[PDB]
Design an enzyme around this catalytic site. Sequence first.
Site, PDB file in Angstrom:
ATOM      1  N   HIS A 148       0.807  -1.212   0.000  1.00 47.44           N
ATOM      2  CA  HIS A 148       0.000   0.000   0.000  1.00 47.44           C
ATOM      3  C   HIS A 148       0.851   1.278   0.000  1.00 47.44           C
ATOM      4  CE1 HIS A 148       0.023  -0.224   4.523  1.00 47.44           C
ATOM      5  NE2 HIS A 148      -0.060   1.106   4.450  1.00 47.44           N
TER       6      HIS A 148
ATOM      7  N   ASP B 115       1.359  -7.737   2.601  1.00 43.70           N
ATOM      8  CA  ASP B 115       1.519  -6.314   2.312  1.00 43.70           C
ATOM      9  C   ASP B 115       2.959  -5.863   2.212  1.00 43.70           C
ATOM     10  OD1 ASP B 115       0.945  -3.578   1.947  1.00 43.70           O
ATOM     11  OD2 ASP B 115      -0.490  -3.464   3.583  1.00 43.70           O
TER      12      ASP B 115
ATOM     13  N   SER C 262       3.646   2.357   8.584  1.00 49.92           N
ATOM     14  CA  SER C 262       3.474   1.404   7.482  1.00 49.92           C
ATOM     15  C   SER C 262       4.815   1.170   6.798  1.00 49.92           C
ATOM     16  CB  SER C 262       2.512   1.971   6.441  1.00 49.92           C
ATOM     17  OG  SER C 262       1.174   1.970   6.912  1.00 49.92           O
TER      18      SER C 262
END
EC number: 3.4.14.-
Lengths: 695, 697
Positions: free
Chosen positions: A63, A205, A630
């Site tokens: 992402h 991810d 992240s």
Amino acid sequence: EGMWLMQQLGRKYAQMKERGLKMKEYDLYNPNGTSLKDAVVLFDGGCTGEVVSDRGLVLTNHHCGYDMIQAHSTLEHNYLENGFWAMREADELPNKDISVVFIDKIEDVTDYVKKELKAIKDPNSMDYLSPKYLQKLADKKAGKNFSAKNPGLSVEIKAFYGGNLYLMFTKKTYTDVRLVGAPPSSIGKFGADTDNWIWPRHTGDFSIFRIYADKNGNPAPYSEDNVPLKPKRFFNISLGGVQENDYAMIMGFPGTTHRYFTASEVDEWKSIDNDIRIRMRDIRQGVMLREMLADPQIKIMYSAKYAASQNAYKRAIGANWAIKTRGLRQNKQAMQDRLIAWGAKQGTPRYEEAVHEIDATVAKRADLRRRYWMIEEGIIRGIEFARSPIPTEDETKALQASARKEAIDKIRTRYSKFANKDYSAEVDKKVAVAMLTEYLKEIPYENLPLHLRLVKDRFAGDVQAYVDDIFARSVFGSEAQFDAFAAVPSVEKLAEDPMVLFASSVFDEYRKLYNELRPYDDPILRAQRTYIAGLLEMDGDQDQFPDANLTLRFTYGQVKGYSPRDNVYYGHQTTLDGVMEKEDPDNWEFVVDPKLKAVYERKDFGRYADRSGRMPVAFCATTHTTGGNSGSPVMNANGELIGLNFDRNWEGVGGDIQYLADYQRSIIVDIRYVLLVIDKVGGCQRLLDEMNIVP
Amino acid sequence: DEGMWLMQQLGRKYAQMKERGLKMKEYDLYNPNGTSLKDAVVLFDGGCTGEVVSDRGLVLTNHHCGYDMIQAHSTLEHNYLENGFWAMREADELPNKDISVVFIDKIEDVTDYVKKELKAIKDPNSMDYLSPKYLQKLADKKAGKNFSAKNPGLSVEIKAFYGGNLYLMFTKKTYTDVRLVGAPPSSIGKFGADTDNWIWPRHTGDFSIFRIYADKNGNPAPYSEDNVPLKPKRFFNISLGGVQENDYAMIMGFPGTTHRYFTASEVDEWKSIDNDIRIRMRDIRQGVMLREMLADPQIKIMYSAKYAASQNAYKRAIGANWAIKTRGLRQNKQAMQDRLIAWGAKQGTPRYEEAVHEIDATVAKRADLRRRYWMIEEGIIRGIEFARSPIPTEDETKALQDASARKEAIDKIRTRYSKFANKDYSAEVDKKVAVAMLTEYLKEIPYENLPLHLRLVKDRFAGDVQAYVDDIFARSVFGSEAQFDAFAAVPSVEKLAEDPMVLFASSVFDEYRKLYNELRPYDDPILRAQRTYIAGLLEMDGDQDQFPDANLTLRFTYGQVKGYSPRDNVYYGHQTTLDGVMEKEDPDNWEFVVDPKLKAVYERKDFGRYADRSGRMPVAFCATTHTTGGNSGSPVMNANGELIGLNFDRNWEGVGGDIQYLADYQRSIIVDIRYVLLVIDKVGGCQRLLDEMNIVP
Ligand SMILES: Oc1ccccc1CN1CCOCC1
Ligand SMILES: Oc1ccccc1CN1CCOCC1
Ligand SMILES: Oc1ccccc1CN1CCOCC1
Ligand SMILES: [Cl-]
Ligand SMILES: [Cl-]
Ligand SMILES: [Cl-]
């Protein structure tokens, strides 16, 4: 529990050693030498990344690299759908507008900043938090020609603890960062929106990039002559995996926290910000879902809009659950009462006065803030025709030179962007009728945007008729109505257009509310400087970290699951078996990549499976993370890479105000699963060969 | 696998039960010639299980078992269904009409007797071996002339087991004066309501209390003011020791039906026809219904019970198909039949393989007819409300075609119209449901197989289902109240014979009955082949590790108190607590409202001797016992035979357990007896019920 400054490693080192840390202090962070800190990057200004090879290979989330993968994707080579695997360095794709920032040096400049601040004259000046003022101090300290004398390096001073501590960062920025590898979106975004903020999680991810530089490893913009960066430090990859209670630590760039909120700020956050966002988005999403389920074409057009609205809606739900069940308001109240009692004993009343100023400011702005959130959630983001075209001053001073055609072409361009391939006027009218009905119930006539007064004055309270009239009479109500206007345009038609008057009126009120509310931020910020100074003087900067501000922080904890509710336990690790359990071939979010399904069926896990023969996918930890973390590297007790942080569970979103030991978890993709995907799905052996993998 | 054992099988299972934790002596649990714990078990109101818990005939069962009795005694002034009921004296206990409790006085193996009587065969294909009428004639012959008059309250019944390979005669003692004694509020008795149905973890205090009344000598008697509480042969002692993970637990009760001896082809048929059609049709029906309920609050009120009733077997079919897909049910039946076929080939007896072949061939032959039957039943009979609209009878049509009996025919038709188009019926909602259901039905059923009236969709309306449905209501006498009243003022047989709704209802019911009549003959060859198939399985592996299918007769099951992992990285423990009830509280959601007295007990930790060792208050537990519908209200026993809970449900992951028990997923959902006693004590204040119970520390 915290997001600690790199300077606070010395003070925390003994506690980390008692929790399992094995590496020497200066091998993790050394203020005057090379350390593991040198392998951490701020990826594309909002994510974290990490260097994993002596040729500048970088790992981050899928992402985080999503925009770069999407920009290189076409119908012929859909990298977003099927993944991307460069089989040679020359095949790695350059990216426009990308950057990686290394934190070369960090220095405490508190005394220097506080001395410079003494020349203020205005006691209520906000220069102590001004990026412009602080940059002037950073440039003065580093030297006039610093970036010219030290190419690739820049300096920046940031405030911490509400302006009680200042750090200067020497940053090395690289702008040639090339896409190397990415799994298909079925792995990179497996849960898609259903599993967002969810633990257990089965999402791989990750994405892979490479830093390029000139012949001497110095930063350089994209050039065909650029060579991979040979970094001074990179992470070793561990294949030992994780066990329950294992020590884990993270380094990264958490964005924002509100750990020093008063109890009144927690009440405001719940009763205004969250309740309004929840109420308005539930209405908007409800109408949208009904229309998407009834028409497959409406589902295609409104799927991304529905998903974007659901993201902060779920965050607000999770935050309100913590406020209601974890006593967040009560814990802030106890914290401020303890400081007030201590201040009374020491004979210093300024701490109680500071909490009083925050409470009085919060109470004073309540109605304005409620009106701001109501219009922002209800109309600005709730109704699409609120962002319909509004003729500029230059466009009106053209329709009434022959630049009438130029004014019409500019208005036409904005109309075409508003009423695009994904816009449905029928869906928008239905959403507006439900949103405005709620808005008109909450906002009294005297506080309404001027055009909305017509609901009562002209349409006898009929919201449906008011919305129907907007589209039936507006030049932006349909293509045929715009074209009729474009053939015979007049400023009188635009000045009395119902959609233009609605859009102008709601934006006028939105700006006016913003302008009236903006002055209330400063007294709270000034009182917070005094409040946090008192908390630090009272209990010390040992067990209370500064709020996140997009600067490099470390957090430590253990690999541990949790009990979300009575008789339910979520373990610390998910497996590939869990991906297969969730497979639904006719649900776009839960489709499974055939190569991954075949690897699972053949148990072709190689050296990546655990001691039981099961293939790990993700794990969770008691580390304290937030947005900005992240792609953060997750380390072993030895500093070896064991995973990448990619999310946090919804039960822990309240962790930005108060860390929740029994519920809050960082959601991490297991590095063994990352290597299994590179190897068995991408077939990119050269990436495995360049990494330093430890058994 | 882990089964529903006959009482006769206790002897051969006893050593395994003892090794699993059982401490009580065999004959204290079940004695074929004397008083045992079996004598404290009752079949409650013909469909539930209950248990005697005092020397004065006090009976415990589920709240959902006693629901109708609590509702029948509830008024606006004394709403017992909402606030609970607690009789503070025996004289205050409420009598119930049409209630019964059945004790299993004696159980006797009559296999040789039945098989000898069956030898007087006129036809080798006779189904008398399974006929309740034939078996009752044999039961009466064995018991004697006027058994019910010579022994009042006693009755005899013979049932077939193992597909007709074993017969048992039950001597039953039935009591019909069973009075309501106590019940918690519905907020405790049905806490999860429909959301938590078939769900573990569960936080529902699913219990109710009754009392058996009898004449002066303890003999059954219908309701009389002179009746006295029954002094039973045996009653359960209540344990306050609680449960721990891995503790031995056992149940006695009346499981209704299982299909443990299905062939692999019957599993395929169950999945691909029964379940897939029910799932597909109900998903369409529920989808339209939900959309109309969410858009109109009045439609939600009218269709909430109909939506919930449809969802119940829909969820069961989903749970069953999950087991067939993930737990290898078809493969395990295939292995079972292949093992018998191999053994039969070595014994030189080919009749077992011939029996499995007959079942497979019969299942394959009836496939299209069964698909058509399920399509019309789920799609129209259940799916469309106007399918059950009034159809004029033969006598009603004859009355309308020269006497004052015409007004009687109109009043009878009006009564049925008023029941069809009641306060909960919406013609607009029904038209929308019918358009979606008929569109799917017409896609699956070819023109030549359609009910006659449905041929008009293609022949008269050019494939427009909406127009066909609109025309039915616009032209029908039952399309609206004004249209019925216009017919009732000037009624003619000709109007009814050509009415579009009458023709639809008649045509779909005609096809439904024709399909039923064509499919009915296929049941007998399967039943006769099952007698041979199960006999072979019994001869091959013995009546030791394979129990007979449930048939609403008394059975025992044993296992352990144990949770399970429903999916990757998720574990559900063995016990829920009162804290879990408080976590689920939602004051504005009817299903999850919490009783203020219960919330106060939780806040004050007023748990007394009912709390667990850590001071937590238990609510429910789950066990690896093998239960099914009929086991609601069953007593759950300790290793010592003491009452530790009442079974009240099973998790959706274990619904496939009716075909194959699922050791790692299937669990009986049980209300902890400590929570039952806590509710009687701290919520009802009914100390006299605790005092009459024999509570062991
Ligand atoms: O699997 C995914 C998860 C999240 C986002 C996108 C995908 C890919 N899907 C695109 C079209 O639908 C089938 C695959
Ligand atoms: O003006 C306000 C706006 C928001 C909150 C509080 C006030 C102060 N009061 C004014 C008089 O009415 C009662 C509230
Ligand atoms: O708590 C219950 C659970 C299941 C069914 C009924 C109730 C009672 N509710 C009726 C109306 O809503 C408040 C109480
Ligand atoms: Cl470097
Ligand atoms: Cl034979
Ligand atoms: Cl299983």
